[PDB]
């Protein structure tokens, strides 16, 4: 069930599709970035078409929609990456096993592109190019994180296996989310940009 | 897509089904165990019916069956663990972030044994306060594998010049595999829980 807005892949399961500047999809993703990163230069935006990652992600979304009995489990977040990690992420998504993990040992995602645009996260390559993903994240029901978590905390210490879906720095006004499982995050767009 | 021989779960997502000695399902697991663990006695064998773990595992299996072409990608392996881990594994499966360092490390992942005797070591199937040991029988997507090494946080590339095209798992020895390490969520389905004693 590959999304409508995807383009034909000639029976292949993986493609990076450069977006056309000035068309709807490009303008949408550009505005989300320029909200907080209007001083950077965008070189290009690519749609990640990974059928395996998409399928595993959609299975987790349908499971979380059943478990939570509601369907607002998804958010659009940012993830800065060094050039050398881009091929891995395009292919295999985000891997907690691969900076400071103050809110737990998972994969980190920023509400604001400004945060992901830090050189510690979006490390400039030899040519000055920085890389940031726009990511669909199953944040689901969340609580405040803490150092050393390997999974989100229990929703009630009387059932230690019924878990929050993610953790955050701040539950009232979140600026980051940590997920602790593979296939809880779909890398949807890659932005290549410069300072 | 839940298997047709599972007990009806009443729209429930999870349950453990106690098996009857004399049924083929119980007897084949007992034979597989006793092949190398003839000194121990089985208390019970439970079929694990976890709808969500099953779906995610079956999606990974279909993807590996597509990627590899006519490989036997699945092996039935053993995993001994402490009583404290059993409720988490039953609900959530095998989390590499929680895995022990193995005495011979072929990578930082979850370890599965070919031989029940290996999983039956007190270091893995730690006796609980009542002297009960716990061992899972696990469908593992071993796929295409190579000899691992202690540094690995994922299986290594098949080809150094193509770093993202990975082996599916690693082993101690490709000639005589006795253990497999997996590095991803939903690559192992816990199918049965063996409770046993001395
Ligand atoms: C404290 O927050 C983080 C810790 C670690 C991070 O990745 C190493 C990270 C954040 S926010 C963010 N956006 N993009 C990335 N990679 N990250």
UniProtKB/Swiss-Prot annotation, chain A:
Record protein name field: Protein mono-ADP-ribosyltransferase PARP15
Top-level lineage group: Eukaryota
Subcellular location: Nucleus
Chain ranges passing through the membrane: none
Protein family according to the UniProt entry: Belongs to the ARTD/PARP family.
Summary of the function given for this chain in its UniProt record: Mono-ADP-ribosyltransferase that mediates mono-ADP-ribosylation of target proteins. Acts as a negative regulator of transcription.
One BP annotation, GO: negative regulation of gene expression
Residue stretches making up the PARP catalytic domain: 2-195
Molecular function as annotated in GO: NAD+ binding; NAD+ poly-ADP-ribosyltransferase activity; NAD+-protein mono-ADP-ribosyltransferase activity; NAD+-protein-aspartate ADP-ribosyltransferase activity; NAD+-protein-glutamate ADP-ribosyltransferase activity; nucleotidyltransferase activity; transcription corepressor activity
Species in which this protein is naturally found: Homo sapiens (Human)
Keywords in alphabetical order: Glycosyltransferase, NAD, Nucleotidyltransferase, Nucleus, Repeat, Transcription, Transcription regulation, Transferase
Coiled-coil zones: none
Coarse class of the protein's main subcellular location: nucleus
GO cellular component: cytoplasm; nucleus
Curated annotation (Swiss-Prot), chain B:
Residue ranges of domain PARP catalytic in the record: 2-198
Subcellular location: Nucleus
Resulting phenotype, residue 80 to A: Slightly reduces catalytic activity. Abolishes activity
Known role: Mono-ADP-ribosyltransferase that mediates mono-ADP-ribosylation of target proteins. Acts as a negative regulator of transcription.
Family per similarity comment: Belongs to the ARTD/PARP family.
Protein name in the entry: Protein mono-ADP-ribosyltransferase PARP15
Entire protein: shown range: 481 to 678 of 678
């Amino acid at each position: 069930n590959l999304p409508e807005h995807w383009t034909d892949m000639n029976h292949q399961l993986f493609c990076m599709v450069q977006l056309e500047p000035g068309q709807s999809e490009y303008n949408t993703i550009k505005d989300k970035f320029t909200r907080t990163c209007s001083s950077y230069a965008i070189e290009k935006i690519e749609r990640i078409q990974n059928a395996f990652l998409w399928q595993s992600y959609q299975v987790k979304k349908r499971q979380m929609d059943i478990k939570n009995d509601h369907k607002n489990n998804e958010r659009l977040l940012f993830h800065g990456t060094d050039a050398d990690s881009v091929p891995y992420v395009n292919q295999h998504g985000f891997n907690r096993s691969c900076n400071a993990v103050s809110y737990g040992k998972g994969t980190y995602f920023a509400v604001d592109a400004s945060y992901s645009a830090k050189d510690t996260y979006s490390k400039p390559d030899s040519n000055g190019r920085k890389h940031m993903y726009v990511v669909r994240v199953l944040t689901g029901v969340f609580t405040k994180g803490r150092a050393g978590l390997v999974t989100p905390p229990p929703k009630n210490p009387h059932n230690p296996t019924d878990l929050f879906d993610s953790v955050t720095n701040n539950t009232r006004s979140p600026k980051l989310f940590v997920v602790f499982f593979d296939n809880q995050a779909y890398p949807e767009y890659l932005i290549t940009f410069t300072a």
